[PDB]
Design a protein around this ligand. Structure first.
Ligand SMILES: NCCn1ccccc1=O
Length: 165
């Protein structure tokens, strides 16, 4: 199972790790992708997870979008986890760089409550433009299921742990 995580709360754990390497090692039941409404996995966590699946995640995602249309900001869908996990929960956090409502971050984290345990990144962090300290606070105050957060950036991981209230 998950190793080397720092316990933040009853159900939230955090580690300085590459979520792709973490997924290949643990092969969790659920890996969360930092998705956009189009499931276009170009960069950030989505681009990295997709590249690890040899683009199978993108092929599956394009078929999902062709059938269902785009997701809502704050919404999610469950697709295959390919070689990374049993399932991938594609969650759309607000992209503040695209001028999206930061209040939608709590709705985005609520999707995690449908899964008993997840390997996840901080939603709306990185290229999505939100403050990762705020994302961690929303995560701990919203998610009730067991969430193992992988933070790629060491300096950000240290800042998150050292400033955690
Ligand atoms: N080897 C994947 C590294 N990584 C982790 C998180 C987000 C983007 C990214 O490229």
């Amino acid at each position: 199972s998950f190793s080397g995580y720092l316990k933040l709360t009853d159900n939230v754990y955090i580690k300085n790790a590459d979520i792709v390497e973490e997924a290949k090692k643990v092969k969790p039941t659920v890996v969360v992708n930092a998705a956009n409404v189009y499931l276009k996995h170009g960069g950030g966590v989505a681009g990295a997870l997709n590249k690890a699946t040899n683009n199978a995640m993108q092929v599956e995602s394009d078929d999902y979008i062709a059938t269902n249309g785009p997701l809502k900001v704050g919404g999610s869908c469950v697709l295959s986890g390919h070689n990374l996990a049993k399932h991938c929960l594609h969650v759309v956090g607000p992209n503040v760089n695209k001028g999206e409502d930061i209040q939608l971050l709590k709705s985005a984290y609520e999707n995690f409550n449908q899964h008993e345990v997840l390997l996840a990144p901080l939603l709306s962090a990185g290229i999505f433009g939100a403050d990762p300290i705020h994302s961690l606070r929303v995560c701990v105050d919203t998610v009730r299921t067991n969430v193992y957060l992988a933070v790629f950036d060491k300096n950000l991981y240290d800042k998150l742990v050292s400033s955690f209230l």
